[PDB]
């Protein structure tokens, strides 16, 4: 009776843990976001320089 209740609950948990393991691999690594943040950091910088260079040209012309 009580051992049965446990058997059923352990079975359910095993399935849940399996689904979580599956879902875990669909989630993105923090290392992927940091590397992307870096690239966006580079694009922040280059765009800043472009805005400066453009202003310069916009005044000469």
């Amino acid at each position: 009776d009580k051992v049965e209740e446990l058997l059923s609950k352990v079975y359910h948990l095993e399935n849940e843990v399996a689904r979580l393991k599956k879902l875990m691999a669909t989630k993105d690594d923090i290392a992927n976001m940091k590397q992307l943040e870096d690239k966006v950091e580079e694009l922040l910088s280059k765009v800043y320089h472009l805005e400066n260079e453009v202003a310069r040209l916009k005044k000469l012309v």
Copy 2:
């Protein structure tokens, strides 16, 4: 006796699997983090459009 031994062993492996999941979870990106990066990509693309239009006029004027 037998079923209880089996249940001890299943619960032990689930505990170790669940413990592994909690450390895996910690190496994964939060959505709110991703949303702030999208906000910066939303900024940069607007600035790149604006610069494209400015450079279009400059090469025309020169």
Copy 3:
């Protein structure tokens, strides 16, 4: 006795797994990250192009 112990550990696992599930729903998927990567691919191409144009505008004007 050993039934109590297993009843106790199961309960704790149920709560742990419920916590992991709602915590899983805060994490962003590789798909949306790949979409953001695509947009960063574009913007990096457009920046390089703009760099070329401006470098020419600079050396053409003065």
